[PDB]
């Protein structure tokens, strides 16, 4: 896990000290941000179905070769698995926005994802295309506020950089 | 470890569910009480030595056998170890209060603490008494009801945070 | 130097990761509490001489035995060293308020202060008395705002807890 | 390490002086531009892989001998470690930008980096070229002038932050 | 670790006997089948990624609850750990096949694997299913019956080595 | 590097022992399989251009999407670099056959190739397709002997498994 | 047990890699050298009693002082223990020839042998004399083939070097 | 428990050796000095109550501020605890004289005493005053022999140095 | 670890008592016998190799199954381990004899030795036999009654030290 | 570390060239002489103790000042360090002979050996003399011309391997 | 150099403490036993040539086989080196007696002697016979006082135990 | 480390000579003054904190720039480091006095102390002043001429031990 509170408390514990002024200051940083990230998280939770479907459609349109036999999307079951993976990543992004840090993403969708995608012949470029489409598709303020958009695009960019 | 928000997302992850509106509202209430929690943590931390020393002294006064030969607080080495353990428990309780979740407390202090104290012969009843005195003093500091030290905060009701501190101390006492 | 920025950057570097949403969040909290701690620091820097004088006067009034021969403060030079000693601590508190963390205090007035004070027979109770007087002398808003007072008293309490 | 506030403190501590009004005002200016600085750091980190890969690719395309045998970027091991070194340099540049001070960069990346590269035979001119390309791309991302990526922030002037990024990259280049 | 020759020696050492004519003949048969054994090991290692990925995928497809929340293959971290542990099991099975003895397998993989999986919460039945799919795939690769891979080998009977691979996989399954 | 001689000498040095019967036995096996593995290396060295060209053509035929803009292979320079790194891998396979172990491959083409290909958006499946075409294109005894073919296909499979 | 197979497998396990071309090559060397190894082992197993008798007789002939009181051969009991020790070493040499490495010797007759012989007043020169006599008594092709003789003399020389 | 015997035995055990000439020689020194240190221990054990009461009276006479509210000794309970602490230290000094080393003091009165006294606001200067009074109060041969006095004052000085 | 003086102090510390006259007189007797104790320790250590080799050889002679295959003294490695354990036990017995207390032995050699031997398969009966032979030889050396090695000491009675050595060896035997 | 084949590969990698026919024929000659090379390594290792002890003894006999006080072979500690030092040098020379390349010898024995010997005060002339005596004895054992020990090998010209051993020993001598 | 002083000082330094009562007690043991051990050292230094001659004569009388060709002592130079080795050991025993500990012996004659004697075919039984003859040949007080004899025989037995 | 006896032995070993009569007489004088030496060591160690505070305070008062900002004794961290260094130097001087040889001091405190202080920026002049003040205080305590505290010892001339302490302190000053 990884968040503002977890980071500052882990640092204090490693130094074996009570939470000092800096730790409280970091928690105030969490407080101020919340609104934006929590809003972004609320919109993602209420609109994930469509967002995940759009991301998967863009992923399979950019790389139609996935539908070829022996590729990651040769079967409708594997296409559904791809949309489910995009759903999982979007849910982890929502968890990161709620948490205020890349913790849920790092632990549940990033750590070991490289080995899994190598083993299952899943090109990281497909996930990258889906998340890039989701990031560029977001519009301000029809979808979220400017800072909620900043949080959403930051989480998406973190996933993209983890995959590239 | 986990904080309140990470606790919420862990609970949501148990069902592959996005963070629901109810959980989001609970975390928004957590954020709105941000200075409530931060002033509580500041009250505990700014009086941490007071809390720990008072709790250990009270546990010793109520159980004079602890400072008798064979007692676990006799030998200044053992007494300093007791004060250090009280400080560590209060530190992790402050961590839990700051995080809004007891995962840090349990995982990094309470995990194996019972077996460790049994192996070292640390009395569980005396440790529980010291932790309970720490609980009472810390709760008093949260509510700014400490007789000898008052911290200036905006008027309000921090009973939720006092109960949270009490719950963390009860977790400590039940772990041993 | 422990502060919000240094703590989060050290955590990121230990993990070998770029500054993520949580680190920017923590820096945002530094931004929000900066007005508070900087007002406290402005008060301390503009009125430190009188504050230090009052703290030293309280320290020697609570402990007149310090003037006795052999004790710390038995000479005018040692009393001046006491006032300068409290002045150093107050300057470190000003530094802590400026950085938003206990780093300056930790590294310059607390680390090794225990060994120094037991070697030079400087009772920590005297420093504690001076800082307790400084903390309880603070008035809102006669001295500073409520939040600046919180920061100032937090720094003073950190020094006190370091001395006990 | 040090940040801007701790740098001001260290400068003030050199003369045993309380942080003066001018230094305090500089720090309030730092805080007021704090949101801009956070956006700059976000721009760098959100495009960090782009910046590093593009800079190493430009270094290779301008010096095709680096990937020839005997070149320091031939052998996928040597090349992946080149990408890792670029990523590390950009990571510490982002650390310096976030901190408003180059102390973290100088102490944790550049100290002994030139001697290390000399020992390994890493060409300092090629490393400087890669760092300069990272400087150009990072500055473009700060100013949101990146030709193949725009990050939306509220309209304003961040030439100071891009100048700071350029100064950190110039410190990297001068160190080697 | 022991091989077939060292296993024979250890059995002879328990009797304080020089390696008898029967044991020498058994090891001579092992040597005469040595080229077949090398081909079998090459068949396993040349398709090790395929074997492991196919077995994990089949284990998941037969037990979809593994990738459900709370399932032990959910969380790409857990999936990577599962693929890694399956690859480790296949690696030690290939070590046993190359050595002609299961000592390396048990001692370096299976000793405490059941206890480790119980502590981790790794499902024993799903792990056994994955190991059994690895068994079938490895056996097919030994006998070059794998429908999607034909390793060119001289015609002959490798059913002894196929049975050895099956026995090693059975030993893995019985260990957990 | 990594070979029979290197492995056994490194083991002896780790145990601090002179070369013994087992090390000489392993080098004897080096001697015995050198004929086939060096015949494979010689054929690869003498006909590498055709093999590399065929592997690259197969890689681009299976994945024409690489020609699309933004992909690895959208320019003639990047296609030339595709054939160049295929030639690099085939040369490392020749080196592995000459050495008798995967040492040259491991150190010069495999180590770090994961990070390189992730950073430069080089899908490992394309390399896998080229090497699979090379492996399945091999004909016995037209191209080389049965055991030389075994060595060559083992090196190719080692590269493939390093990528997948 | 130190052998070709165990050495290669241990190296691969330490590197965490599947058996590669070099491991199979080393096992091929085991296959090729096994003929001479097992010929020497079978001859030693079939004629060990006479060989052990000759080695013990030579040991006590070169060092008659062993029969003096307070020495290692000061009684028929420990003269028989000397012959049993030579039989143990010859059996371990047979095990080494069967195994293909010094493993059995290293683990069962050499490890701790120095401490035992120092503690029990057993001069290593007597063992060395027995093994030197066995080595120089071997006749080719009368006792075994030339390469079986190489293996047998190598095992004996390894024991001698472990004792000197 | 640090003493001559324990020190030499621990050194020999760390080097894994039997007690050699130096160890027996150190124990012989224990034999030589035991007369003086045991005379000191006997005198202290026989007259400890007066010595402890008198050290406490000196401590509270040098620091009458300890009776002030909020200070150590502000109540009769805390004054009795002060005398009990001086009794504990004198008993540990008796133990040190008995064992001939600082072991009992190090493990039971000195280790952690710094943290205990800082946490409980017990100034080290008060303990130092008590022990300095006890040391300078001793008279030769009035209270004990010259060498018994040397050992007693050495133990007291060790306690003082541990407190300063 | 503790010695006789440390043992007396620990016993006194239990009652918060200054070392009594009786304990002081006992330690004065210990000192007055200190030259005899050094004589005894010198007699043991000067014949340590003799004692250990003789004890292990006798344990083997009465039980030739120990050196038979599967026995715990077969394999010169195991033989050297047995001689090393005898030497270690005698070394800690000599430590106890020099210290006048068994704390060093019980805390550094016997602590966990029984379970270690059980896990290793070291026979407790044979170990006890070896320790008993070490006891007999060490006691003979204390009393200067060893038939083949006499060490010159002034005439006196060291039966107390011989009994102490026997008590330490009996403690070793009872621990296993 | 490199062997002859890896040396050829490294040389060809510098030119981005597939292993040429000439280098392939050279390695084929290496393999065809491989039995002779194994015999040479066997001759060295079978007489390793003889070679090392004889070389150190000859160095001492030609330079008696080495065993005088202040000499580097006085003090059995230093003498055993010298014997182990020469044994290590011979072991790495045998590694080089087995590999056909001095890479292992240079990198794992001679790298820093000269500086280490200078720091320890080990005389380089005496080290060179001991290494040269090792060279002469090892070359004699390769050619089976050792007067007091003959090893049954096939008749042939092993002067190439003897010259290789001489070259490795000369590399050792030049390094120090 | 292991002695009483060096052992206690090394223990104190490892604990990072000033010399305490136990260290001074151990040095008092140095003082007490110095008379006997220095008397032994003086007698050995004054009569070492004849002692060494007798020890070497006894060594070669116990083991005349050492004169046989190929054995240690088959040449006059090797016999002279045997007598010189006994002289070295007696000089180190004199050094141990002067020092008060086995330090000089451990560092200069014992450490590595095992490897040296195994490499040079020097049977430890010969050294043991020489030292046993020297130990049993000593007479009280014809050669030295009882306690000087104790120290001399202790050093000799230490050498013997190092060899057996 | 070496003591006076070890120093004499080392000097005799350089000539391969048994310890001469003159050296034996010198060591007998060392032993006869051994009680005086223990007296002196006790006087130093019983006032160790006294001496260290005396020296560091005098060095600071003579050079007030040490506690000014940028001075090496300003910042309680540096002040405690200075006090610890003074205590360490005094501890090693007492080790040398007890041993009657500088070996322990040179090898464990002064070895590399000058370069360490130069790298840290520790002022060699101020460190030497502190060491000289320690020398004065230690000499006064050896001769029992300290004005504030006297230690009861039998009347006698300890000028040799005072000169030894002075020599050790001057050796410390020369090293830095």
TrEMBL record, chains A, C, F, G, H, K:
Positions contributing to (2R,3E)-phycoerythrobilin 9 binding: 137, 142
Keyword list, A-Z: Antenna complex, Bile pigment, Chloroplast, Chromophore, Electron transport, Membrane, Photosynthesis, Phycobilisome, Plastid, Thylakoid, Transport
Binding, (2R,3E)-phycoerythrobilin 4: 43, 139, 142-143
Binding-site residues for (2R,3E)-phycoerythrobilin 7, renumbered to this chain: 81, 84-85, 127
Protein name (record): R-phycoerythrin class I alpha subunit
Cited Pfam families: Phycobilisome
Residues that bind (2R,3E)-phycocyanobilin: 82
Gene that specifies this protein: cpeA
Membrane-related topology note: Peripheral membrane protein
Main localization, broad class: plastid
UniProt xrefs under InterPro entries: Globin-like_sf, Phycobilisome_asu/bsu, Phycobilisome_asu/bsu_sf
Similarity section: Belongs to the phycobiliprotein family.
GO biological process, one term: photosynthesis
Domain of life: Eukaryota
Amino acids binding (2R,3E)-phycoerythrobilin 3: 43, 137
Keyword match Ribonucleoprotein: no
TrEMBL record, chains B, D, E, I, J, L:
Ligand binding (phycourobilin 2): 50, 129, 148
Cellular component terms per the entry's GO annotation: chloroplast thylakoid membrane; phycobilisome
Annotated residues for binding of (2R,3E)-phycoerythrobilin 1: 35, 39, 156
Modified residues (N4-methylasparagine): 72
SUPFAM superfamilies: Globin-like
Binding site for (2R,3E)-phycocyanobilin 1: 35, 39, 158
Chief site of localization: plastid
Domain of life from the UniProt record: Eukaryota
Intracellular or extracellular location(s): Plastid, Chloroplast thylakoid membrane
Record-listed (2R,3E)-phycoerythrobilin 2 binding positions: 35, 156
Residues given in the record as (2R,3E)-phycoerythrobilin 4 binding sites: 72-73, 77-78, 84-85
Record keyword Nucleotide-binding present: no
Binding site for phycourobilin 1: 50, 61, 129
Positions with a binding annotation for phycourobilin 4: 61, 129, 148-149
InterPro entries: Globin-like_sf, Phycobilisome_asu/bsu, Phycobilisome_asu/bsu_sf
Annotated positions binding (2R,3E)-phycoerythrobilin 3: 35, 156, 158
Keywords: Antenna complex, Bile pigment, Chloroplast, Chromophore, Electron transport, Membrane, Methylation, Photosynthesis, Phycobilisome, Plastid, Thylakoid, Transport
Binding site for phycourobilin 5: 61, 136, 147-148
Protein residues bound to (2R,3E)-phycoerythrobilin 5: 72-73, 77-78, 84, 117
CDD domains (UniProt xref): PE_beta-like
Ligand binding (phycourobilin 3): 54, 129, 136, 148
PANTHER family: C-PHYCOCYANIN BETA SUBUNIT, PHYCOBILISOME 32.1 KDA LINKER POLYPEPTIDE, PHYCOCYANIN-ASSOCIATED, ROD 2-RELATED
Family affiliation: Belongs to the phycobiliprotein family.
Name of the protein described by the UniProt record: R-phycoerythrin class I beta subunit
Organism: Schizymenia dubyi
Gene coding for it: cpeB
């Amino acid at each position: 896990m990884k968040s503002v509170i977890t980071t500052t408390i882990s640092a204090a514990d490693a130094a074996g000290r009570f939470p000092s002024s800096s730790d409280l200051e970091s928690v105030q940083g969490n407080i101020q941000r919340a609104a934006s990230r929590l809003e972004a998280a609320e919109k993602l939770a209420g609109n994930h179905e469509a967002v995940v479907k759009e991301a998967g459609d863009a992923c399979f349109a950019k790389y139609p070769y996935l539908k070829n036999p022996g590729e990651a999307g040769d079967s409708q079951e594997k296409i559904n698995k791809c949309y489910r993976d995009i759903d999982h990543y979007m849910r982890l992004i929502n968890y990161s926005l709620v948490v205020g840090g890349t913790g849920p993403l790092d632990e549940w969708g990033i750590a070991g994802a490289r080995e899994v995608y190598r083993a299952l012949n899943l090109p990281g470029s497909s996930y990258i295309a889906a998340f890039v489409f989701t990031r560029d598709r977001l519009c301000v303020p029809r979808d979220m506020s400017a800072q909620a958009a900043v949080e959403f695009s930051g989480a998406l960019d973190y996933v993209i950089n983890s995959l590239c | 470890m986990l904080d309140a928000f990470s606790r919420v997302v862990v609970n949501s992850d148990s069902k592959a569910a996005y963070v629901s509106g109810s959980d989001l509202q609970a975390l928004k209430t957590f954020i709105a009480d941000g200075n409530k929690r931060l002033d509580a943590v500041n009250s505990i931390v700014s009086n941490a030595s007071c809390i720990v020393s008072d709790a250990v002294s009270g546990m010793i006064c109520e159980n004079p056998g602890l400072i008798a030969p064979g007692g676990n607080c006799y030998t200044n080495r053992r007494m300093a170890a007791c004060l250090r353990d009280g400080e560590i428990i209060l530190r992790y309780t402050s961590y839990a209060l700051l995080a809004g979740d007891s995962s840090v407390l349990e995982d990094r202090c309470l995990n194996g603490l019972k077996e460790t104290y049994i192996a070292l012969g640390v009395p569980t009843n005396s440790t529980a008494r010291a932790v309970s005195i720490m609980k009472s003093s810390a709760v008093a500091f949260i509510s700014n009801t400490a007789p000898q030290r008052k911290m200036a905060t905006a008027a309000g009701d921090c009973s939720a945070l006092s109960s949270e501190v009490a719950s963390y101390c009860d977790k400590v006492s039940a772990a041993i």
